Amino acid sequence: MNPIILIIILMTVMLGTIIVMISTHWLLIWIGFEMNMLAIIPIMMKKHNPRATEASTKYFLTQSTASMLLMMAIIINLMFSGQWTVMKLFNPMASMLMTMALAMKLGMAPFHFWVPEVTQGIPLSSGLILLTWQKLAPMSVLYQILPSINLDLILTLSILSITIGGWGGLNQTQLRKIMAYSSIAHMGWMTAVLLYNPTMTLLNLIIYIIMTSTMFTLFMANSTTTTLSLSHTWNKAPIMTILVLITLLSMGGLPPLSGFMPKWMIIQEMTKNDSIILPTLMAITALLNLYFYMRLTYSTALTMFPSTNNMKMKWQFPTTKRMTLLPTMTVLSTMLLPLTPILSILE
Amino acid sequence: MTGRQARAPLQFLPDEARSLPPPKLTDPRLAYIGFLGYCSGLIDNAIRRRPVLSAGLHRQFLYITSFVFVGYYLLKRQDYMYAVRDHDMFSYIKSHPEDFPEKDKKTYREVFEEFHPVR
Amino acid sequence: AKTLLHQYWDIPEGTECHRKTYAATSIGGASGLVVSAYSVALKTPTSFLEGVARTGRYTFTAAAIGAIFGLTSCISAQVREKPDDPLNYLIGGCAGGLTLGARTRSYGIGAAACAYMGLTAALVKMGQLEGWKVFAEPKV
Amino acid sequence: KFYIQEPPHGSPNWLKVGLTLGTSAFLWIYLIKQHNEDVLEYKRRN
Amino acid sequence: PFFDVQKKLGVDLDHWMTIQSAEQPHRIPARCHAFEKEWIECAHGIGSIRAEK
Amino acid sequence: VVRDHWIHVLVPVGFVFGYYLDRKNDEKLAAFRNKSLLYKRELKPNEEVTWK
Amino acid sequence: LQYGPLAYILGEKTTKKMTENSKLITVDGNICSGKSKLAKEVAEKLGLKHFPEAGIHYADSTTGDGKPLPVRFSGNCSLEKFYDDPKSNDGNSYRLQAWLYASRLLQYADALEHLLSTGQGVVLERSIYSDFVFLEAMYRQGFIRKQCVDHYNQVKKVTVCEYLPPHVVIYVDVPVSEVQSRIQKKGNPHEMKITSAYLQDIENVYKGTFLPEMSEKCEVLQYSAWEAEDAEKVVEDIQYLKYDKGPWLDQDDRKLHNLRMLVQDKLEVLNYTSIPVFLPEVTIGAHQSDRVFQEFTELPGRKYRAGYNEDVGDKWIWL
Amino acid sequence: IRWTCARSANVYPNFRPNTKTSLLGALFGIGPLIFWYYVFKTDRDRKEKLIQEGKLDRTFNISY
Amino acid sequence: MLKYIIPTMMLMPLTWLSKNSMIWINTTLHSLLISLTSLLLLNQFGDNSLNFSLTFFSDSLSTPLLILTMWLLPLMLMASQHHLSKENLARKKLFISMLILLQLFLIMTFTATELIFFYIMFEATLVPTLIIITRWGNQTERLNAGLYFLFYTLAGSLPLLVALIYIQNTMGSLNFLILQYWVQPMPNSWSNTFMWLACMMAFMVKMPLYGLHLWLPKAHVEAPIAGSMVLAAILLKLGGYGMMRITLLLNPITDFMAYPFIMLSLWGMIMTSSICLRQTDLKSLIAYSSVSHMALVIVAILIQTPWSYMGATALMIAHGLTSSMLFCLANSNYERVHSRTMILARGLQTLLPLMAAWWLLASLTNLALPPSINLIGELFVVMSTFSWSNITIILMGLNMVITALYSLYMLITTQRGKHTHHINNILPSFTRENALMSLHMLPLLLLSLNPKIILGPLY
Amino acid sequence: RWIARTFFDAPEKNYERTMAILQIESEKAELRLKELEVRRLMRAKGDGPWFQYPTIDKALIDHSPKATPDN
Amino acid sequence: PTLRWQEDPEPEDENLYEKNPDSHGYDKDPAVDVWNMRVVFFFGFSIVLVLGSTFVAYLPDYRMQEWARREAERLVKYREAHGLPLMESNCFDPSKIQLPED
Amino acid sequence: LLDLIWLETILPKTISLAQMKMSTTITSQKGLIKLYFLSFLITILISTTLLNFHE
Amino acid sequence: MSLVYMNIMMAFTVSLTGLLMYRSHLMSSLLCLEGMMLSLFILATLMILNSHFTLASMMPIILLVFAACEAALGLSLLVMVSNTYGTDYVQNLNLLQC
Lengths: 347, 119, 140, 46, 53, 52, 319, 64, 459, 71, 102, 55, 98
Description:
This is part of a larger assembly, with 13 protein chains of 13 kinds.
Chain A: H1 3-22, H2 27-40, H3 50-79, H4 92-106, H5 115-120, H6 124-145, H7 151-167, H8 175-191, H9 198-219, H10 227-236, H11 239-252, H12 260-271, H13 277-288, H14 291-302, E1 307-308, H15 311-314, H16 326-334
Helix pairs in contact in A: 1-2, 1-6, 2-3, 2-6, 3-4, 4-6, 6-9, 7-8, 7-13, 8-9, 9-11, 9-12, 9-16, 10-14, 11-14
Chain E: H1 5-10, H2 33-42
Chain J: H1 2-6, H2 11-45
Protein name (chain M): NADH-ubiquinone oxidoreductase chain 4L
Subcellular location (chain M): Mitochondrion inner membrane
InterPro entries (chain M): NADH_UbQ_OxRdtase_chain4L/K, NUOK/Mnh_C1-like
């Protein structure tokens, strides 16, 4: 590697997602997905272990077959009414394959088998960029193609994604698998609204991206990957404890805190239809996926685990890390309760 | 609610946003954003081991200024969007007046209801 | 699946008895095929014969649930003869849960199965009686 | 001066802090300018 | 979203690959050219659901 | 003389500030002044007010 | 700071401060014999800077103010107590040894930092490698449970499989009776209460394991006791050497950049210290840890980033 | 301390649900509940049907 | 009321930028000043409540509870020393600021305009008490207690939000004034039954009722004194307040579906009075006492007489004061001996002579002291429920007998009979404990003089 | 009378404030019900300016002399 | 051979007295103890309790109570002066009602 | 017999043990690849032919 | 529906199942992915040639050159997998267990 080479490759990730955003054509969208894949491979395997090698293998196979299934759906769309415009499709079967391909692309619960396995054995920068941009890219396409989708697919993937992202993690102690299960749950929440009012989906996308950036930045405050390392972060610095506390509780979704705002407004514009069984199921599982958050909190923020010396040795040294933009994103991502009428900023 | 005349691309502050009263000094929402900026700079000094409430005073001033600037433009776009929602609503009222009849506003001298005695 | 659940709701409640049990056995066999397909495709039971054994056992238990549920549905509808209550199907779902606990040979776990399957059957009959739109409106 | 021969920083510069104060004054003058122009625009129209 | 740098800069960098019935280089037609011209002239200022209706 | 303790002065200043803001809010909500149907009189006796 | 990616692009290289002065030479020998004598000798002769033996309070002696903190903070090693009773049910060997491991890693990080930062090459002594030799011999004397030895071995698996080996190792051999005579010359009774079978096991494992695990990586120059000062002969056969083995011919710019940006941010070096397996000699209760951290904040110098801390300076909190 | 910790916290282990314990629980919890529920059924049906007849003792019955 | 919210925002950084040995007096003094400032509140008159803004309006149900909250704050803020004097200055500031933030969300909760704002501030009340009891629980299962607390209160209080959005998009706006004017009977469907069960079940969980009260004993035996008193008094009576406001709608079906909650409330009140008769761990006796009195409150809510509502709010305020006092008595006993049990610390008539006056007075207030507010509440609830049914007076009087019984046994187990003559480490009676008791009980007797304040809006 | 003179507020003041806020939120409830009616009927019909998903723009559709005389 | 710990004998019993016999309830700084006693027994009782007592002892009556007394006296004297019985029932005008018939 | 042990078995224990068992059955998939793609296959087939989405 | 499209899509589905189920290696899986690529190429090529879709005839060549470099990436990844082991089995990938 070189820093210039990384400038170029991250520039191409930016360019690929922008080409996904910007074109009215299908080929450029598929090229954007492919360039996203090709450029996001070398961000993984930034170190040199076979863990990242197998993770990159799993990611490449699932990512590739999702792109190929998408291209199949587009060519079926031109087997029916023939144009390369990004609008309503003209086949239940092509839309069926397209939603399944995008579901493998981002990760739903039938297709979520690769996400924790790829997010464990990688460095944290690779995981952050894959989570943010790989959940940012297909939602643009779904926002554009929404009026041709049978609701059974999006509804089933959303319900199943929320419940499997809830039920996974309760045995899990690796923090990357915890955050990946949280990603599955929030993508289910981001999916279950799209046939009703997509403004909520893109708003939940913005909120989840800012929360994930704050989360992985406070995991990059020092080299930590397990909970016992977070107990050592307790005994080495007090401010990291309360910041991890507040960001975890905003991922939990509690009303005086900013992460409740995507939940409740989704419940509102859900229930202006006659959907009641779906909000109560989704919200009971949103109660369920708070327990692993809460046991992480109970572990390393409010109880006081016994620590190990050479933290005495670590006390002499300043935190000379770099933060990309930590405090701005943190207090913007936590105290954002009374700015709920910034819903309409999204048009 | 979809665009609604994207002809006229995304356009972060449109032309008709100057055809409506902008927000003013000491409005409470921008004051909230300013306190959020003060807390932002304070917690930025709280990240590193530099002392709180000191030695970041230019960072205090810069963060507060930047957040007030951003939030001011966001408030302008917000009021534009609510105003254009209002105009679209009343214009659809004007387009189909026949579909929305005036309901039978009876006075309560002639309204029969049920009583359901609790005891 | 869709056409045979529509067959089940086409059978009135009402008394067109044991065709209800035929449809409920078909529903239970379909659901057992689903869960057995997951359990054989996510395990590698080593070997193929044991996989066929696990699939047949799962489909047999789920068809037993549907069979005994439809039987006591018909029994409530013919003996007590209140056609539009959630109470009879609360009893029915409890019967299905207790027979599931019998086929898995667990007693308190069978009582929990009684409670939850009875409440779900009461929800299904109750919302279908009042009329609650499944999955969507999907209008606004 | 009290350290083991290692000042990393702490003795302040005069480029970064002056640049930040200048750009924040720039942003205050620009926002007051924009707000006065928009008040004048609303007075022009109505 | 559906961003429109496409319209803000106003460059037809994508509006030629899009449908049939555009300006083919040697001016040759497709098989169903007039049908697309009539269907698009049916569906220009049309709100995408009454397009179906 | 005030700088001996600038700490204890703070909360009555906060209360007076909130009270002034509530009076300004009530001035913002100054509709139906004499338009009520029970507590109704003219602009009388002194000068043009019934509550302020 | 003049580091990071932008400083690496705008700056010339990390390679043009080479060579033949920038090198890692390491004098390695027994306790009380192979010591700072020949290290300071070759530092004055070859024109090449010098680090002392890694002290217990070396972390205090390398940052903050030069005055070392008392052993409530830098301890609880008590090397004099280890020479008194190295079979403590109170726990004295392994806590001391993990602290000295962190000290060895800190001074080796200082060595590689000074090597990559412009030069000009350093001599080291009593390295990390002699530290695992110390643990192996100390377990041969039966002082530590084997699980705790497995823990130190896991720390060695993590931290040592990361960095570059030194260039050369100047090995000193001094026999057991001669170290006994030199420790009688040294005459510290706390140090004189050491035994000799422990020293014998040190030299046995220190020849039988350290030297084959060199295998001409870290080219060894093996000397006798009177084969010392003799400074001309050691600079002569340092001039003889040719630097074949080791990855020092294969870095060439990227990995030197990686170690430049990895050795600085010392907390990124030292995050891998507490694994933890919880080591019943080593852990600390919560109340003791809290009061020790509060008393650490109750020093003047070590009280939240002294470059910004008042009462010593630095006259600028920007009014 | 042993008696207190056994009396409060060391109850929930050890537990096994026996049929005799379960039947005794459902009798000591639901029996009197459905008993008083039947008598509130009885008294409320009598009183409400009596006042639906209108023949209450409501000569003056203000403090309801 | 905004002039009551904004000095609480000003009271938070007081704690931060006051120095060592200077935070304490400033916080205590200024919160007592706020107690004066909202003692100035009671302007409420006649036809309506005192209603100022799109933001604020206050009933005379909300008035005594809000005065009680702001009065209970500085008493507590003095009460919570001696267990964090040895802790850090920064952790002490975090503790006190967390208390102030909790008060702020309590006032926000009591003066809510629409019930959405009430729900937001309801779970905003929920969140910091967790942090208080978990960071200073001082017993090994504060883990389990906080976990039970948050999961029960969320997962019971979760469908309430859905039902409120449903009432939003079926009947216009959710302000309590127009909902008072735009109520209409929603008859016996099944969806009406589910919606009523959702709202009432959420506040049932907040009370708690007998069905899932199990979080409440652990949350009082495994909590510090400040979170315990806030929890018991303000949170449980806040749940009662919320049920009082939401029960205005959904009148026609409560005769159909209000029977079993009455049943579980009455029989669980009797069983709770039975189970607190025998247990050790003195701190828990007040918690089961609270369960009994709030079961009585719930019976008082679900019968729908103005007599019943006035007795309900009287019992609310009276048990809030009594239970907070008795918590502080148990905290004094736990400062004397490090036991928390019931049979260990005995004697205490010889030692601490005027402490006996406060134990006697507290057991009197549990005992329905004959002009006290507690007896007023219990008496009018018995009146309204004997109007509701002529046979339920048996359970009420059996509750009365056992209530007197366990209150008296709580007295004479600790402070009667023999000093154990091996303890020998009790300090004499501090002026702090007696000061806190004079702060508790003089307002209770003043309200016992002229109780026309504490009766509710149906006065 | 001193309390009523320097501390409290007039019942006319409170009464008219209640009247004004009831007027405000009555208009808000009317507009909200009108909003949901407009949204559901506009999604049902499609005439209004809101739910217009982007169809084809006929800038590239051109009339010209082609090659094949049947077009 | 093992104890798994390194801390003090924790805790330690700490009597607050026997360093200031004239101390009030809280900590060992003796002057601010008297400051705290002064501030709580003046700004909790001498200016809060008795002033709130005299505030609640008389204030303008809730529910316009004495107003309701005098209004009821006036209206009952009115109705007994005009011969008709006090509390005429049917509180709304039965001529001004529109009953939906059967 | 009523409050402590039986109420703590009926409300927390059944829910908590149910969620614990569903966790130990779902997340305890050993890390193969063929299993995941066969899960993809049975998902595609059970979406097409059992409960159809195109029809 | 131009019945060559029928068995082309059928063989596409069989190629997709070949990509999904595989028991020994990974190069065979990548080869079936290449066959699926060929299927997409052929179907789009026959359609654009049928429709006289002369203006946007870029689709099959650009589709295959892009999915070609995709396959190249897959080859480099499988070489790295086979180089950190002796083989390229589906087995000996079960580490990083779940």
